[PDB]
Amino acid sequence: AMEQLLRAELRTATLRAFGGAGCISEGRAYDTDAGPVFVKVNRRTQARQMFEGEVASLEALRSTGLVRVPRPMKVIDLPGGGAAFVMEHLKMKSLSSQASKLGEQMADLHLYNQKGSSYVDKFGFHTVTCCGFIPQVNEWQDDWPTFFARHRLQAQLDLIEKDYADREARELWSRLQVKIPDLFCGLEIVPALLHGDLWSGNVAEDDVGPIIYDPASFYGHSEFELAIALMFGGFPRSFFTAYHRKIPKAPGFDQRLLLYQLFNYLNHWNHFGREYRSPSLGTMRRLLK
Amino acid sequence: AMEQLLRAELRTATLRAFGGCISEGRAYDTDAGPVFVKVNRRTQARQMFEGEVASLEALRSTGLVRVPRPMKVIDLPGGGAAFVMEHLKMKSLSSQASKLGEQMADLHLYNQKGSSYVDKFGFHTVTCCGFIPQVNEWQDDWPTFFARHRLQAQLDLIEKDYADREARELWSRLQVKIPDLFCGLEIVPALLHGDLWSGNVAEDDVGPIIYDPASFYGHSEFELAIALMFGGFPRSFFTAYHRKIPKAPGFDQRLLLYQLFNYLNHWNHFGREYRSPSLGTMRRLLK
Ligand SMILES: Nc1ncnc2c1ncn2[C@@H]1O[C@H](COP(=O)(O)OP(=O)(O)O)[C@@H](O)[C@H]1O
Ligand SMILES: Nc1ncnc2c1ncn2[C@@H]1O[C@H](COP(=O)(O)OP(=O)(O)O)[C@@H](O)[C@H]1O
Ligand SMILES: O=C(CN1CCOCC1)[C@@H](O)[C@H](O)[C@H](O)CO
Ligand SMILES: O=C(CN1CCOCC1)[C@@H](O)[C@H](O)[C@H](O)CO
Ligand SMILES: [Mg+2]
């Protein structure tokens, strides 16, 4: 895909993706008397809530001992509104040689609730975790399709109705709601702890192995994790090969992939505007065909 | 400031910065240099990028402002396009603000003062202020161009998508009043960056840089509306600019009209969070 096309169009052997930073917050590294730190700053009223959700997500991931993520250090209220979030600084480059290792770790992470001393038998989370700026409901639910329809898709489409009053999105959603159970093939879904935002921009590596960060975690269907990884690219094929060697694709994976990508398109419509209307409606129509 | 707050909360004497999306894309080190690649998967990505290339080319041809050099527009398998350009190591505009003010004023004076005068408002191709394509059809009269191909275009989209009664009624009243803000003044076409908000300007060790243009020949004052309305420019930017192009009479009222355009564009891009500023600005203009 992209990287091969660029090597050809620009006629280069090497191509190494690199690189205040961030889509939601302003992030900067500082050296301090006790070593380096990384600080995210967000001036919006809800910033503390956002960062507390990130802290809870980082803590949940660190507790598994299966992946490396930055240690959360402090959330600081700012005079004039908003908050700063200080965490451990990690020297990092984009994910490349460590992709297959990350695929193993992400599969082990999803499997931990099933295989480990872990007993979470509902979907959701113990606290609010933000989809970028947007707070998510993580109310525990026994049924994954219910949790995903109500607390992910319907939540996003209610915000689209409030902000864009989009007739087509409303009418397509009413039809898709009816279809959703058929996409699950009568499978028994088991809760899996998710990073929650595993875009290629949120993963990286150093000389020890891969690193992931910026989580928005909850107990969900393991497959949901991969949708954003696939739709914006940037992961080597060997990441998915390693992952699916441990967690094979269940029947209907390809159709659920559209459903989970739909959620991310809706979230990008809400965060970033009407540019994301066409893929949102287009994915709904593809699911309804 | 926030840095003193961090020193206090982390209990550290030192705090030395180091290490130096939004549906853009990514940067890549490349054999022949660093490059920056913008990706857009939508069907109209190529037209969008060709407008950005045309704008960058028009600005580069003045030699007055530093912009990234366009390299290639690539059709992407499965729709959309990538736009590859020279990579620039950049930081927030700060020390170079007054220099950029000077350069932007020279840019706006370039057309009037040069050899090959463009005598109409508009542009030779479509350019996008963000994602929405604009009409750049040449017009002799700036208030005509702006009312028709900027304000009316945005309000037609708002009527189409939102059927907003208040916007429709306020525009009915405002349209006739526009020429009052321009009477008794000479308006010369000026080449504009077209989207000069603080997030589209920066600097390095050599000087300021501007990027993501949506260019057209317009009233010079239009440039500054989005710079002012969202902040982020040092005062010295404007001081330097207005030493060369002083605020003409009626500047503050035209400023509201130009900011109105940007509020409407944001309503069309991002939805009804921008409805209140749009209608309020129209009411201010009617008071
Ligand atoms: N703990 C860290 N140490 C060093 N660099 C980091 C760290 N966390 C993030 N970064 C850098 O900051 C960028 C943005 O971080 P991210 O958590 O994705 O911010 P946002 O939520 O605002 O997008 C990352 O691509 C990475 O380059
Ligand atoms: N030529 C470049 N070299 C290096 N970084 C760039 C270049 N162009 C843009 N960037 C970075 O990408 C960010 C967004 O660029 P921009 O052209 O505004 O994209 P968009 O149209 O998606 O907003 C900038 O704020 C800057 O940090
Ligand atoms: O920002 C994120 C990823 N998108 C940024 C815009 O270019 C496409 C990838 C993630 O942190 C998340 O899915 C959400 O966008 C946060 O708002
Ligand atoms: O994105 C832009 C600037 N706005 C981003 C949201 O915070 C206020 C400034 C520009 O590219 C353009 O003026 C238009 O918004 C379409 O993108
Ligand atoms: Mg920009």
Author numbering:
A (entry chain B): 0 to 18, 21 to 290
B (entry chain A): 0 to 19, 24 to 290
Give the original sentences from the paper that presented this experimental model.
Glycation, a non-enzymatic post-translational modification occurring on proteins, can be actively reversed via site-specific phosphorylation of the fructose-lysine moiety by FN3K kinase, to impact the cellular function of the target protein. Alternatively, the sugar moiety on glycated residues can be phosphorylated by a class of small-molecule kinases called fructosamine-3-kinases (FN3Ks), which are present in mammals, birds, and plants. Further characterization indicated that FN3K is responsible for protein deglycation by phosphorylating protein-associated fructosamines. Here, we determined a series of crystal structures of HsFN3K in the apo-state, and in complex with different nucleotide analogs together with a sugar substrate mimic to reveal the features important for its kinase activity and substrate recognition.
